Amino acid sequence: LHKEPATLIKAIDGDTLKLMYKGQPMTFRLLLVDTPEFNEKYGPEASAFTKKMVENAKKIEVEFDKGQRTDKYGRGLAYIYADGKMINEALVRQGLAKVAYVYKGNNTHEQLLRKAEAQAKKEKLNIWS
Numbered sequence: 329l330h331k332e333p334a335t336l337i338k339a340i341d342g343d344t345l346k347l348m349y350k351g352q353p354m355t356f357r358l359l360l361v362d363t364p365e366f367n368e369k370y371g372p373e374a375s376a377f378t379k380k381m382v383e384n385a386k387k388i389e390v391e392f393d394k395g396q397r398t399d400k401y402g403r404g405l406a407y408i409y410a411d412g413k414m415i416n417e418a419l420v421r422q423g424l425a426k427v428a429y430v431y432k433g434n435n436t437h438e439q440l441l442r443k444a445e446a447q448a449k450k451e452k453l454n455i456w457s
């Protein structure tokens with residue numbers, strides 16, 4: 329896999345954001361995770377977490393997996409990095425997302441994320457509290 333440039337347009341919530349990619353606005357959905365919706369427990373916290381990471385970032389990158397790059401809603405499906413730190417992994421490590429939506433063929437970072445979730449679970453963080 330490889331990282332490609334993008335710039336932030338707008339934070340949306342814990343696991344979605346609007347980025348400019350190859351010069352075009354698109355909404356991205358984070359691969360392999362599920363944050364609570366804003367109206368759910370920890371939703372506001374997940375939103376804030378992702379917003380801070382992307383807004384503070386000097387460099388945002390998107391990394392597609394090997395499979396589908398757009399979902400049925402037209403959202404880009406990627407791993408998204410802020411100054412080299414993967415947001416998908418960071419949310420999970422903090423107990424602000426569950427590993428979820430693991431579809432065959434777009435699952436390159438599955439085991440990395442599951443290891444993060446185990447450690448969040450051990451620490452009884454947030455969702456796991």
Ligand SMILES: Cc1cn([C@H]2C[C@H](OP(=O)(O)O)[C@@H](COP(=O)(O)O)O2)c(=O)[nH]c1=O
Pocket residue numbers: 357358359360361362399400405429431
């Ligand atoms: C993360 C992800 C979501 N989706 C689809 C599955 C779910 O369909 P349904 O809308 O029919 O439930 C939805 C969940 O996204 P959200 O968690 O953003 O609601 O997005 C994908 O198809 N591929 C993906 O990799």
Ligand SMILES: [Ca+2]
Pocket residue numbers: 343362363364365
């Ligand atoms: Ca969600």
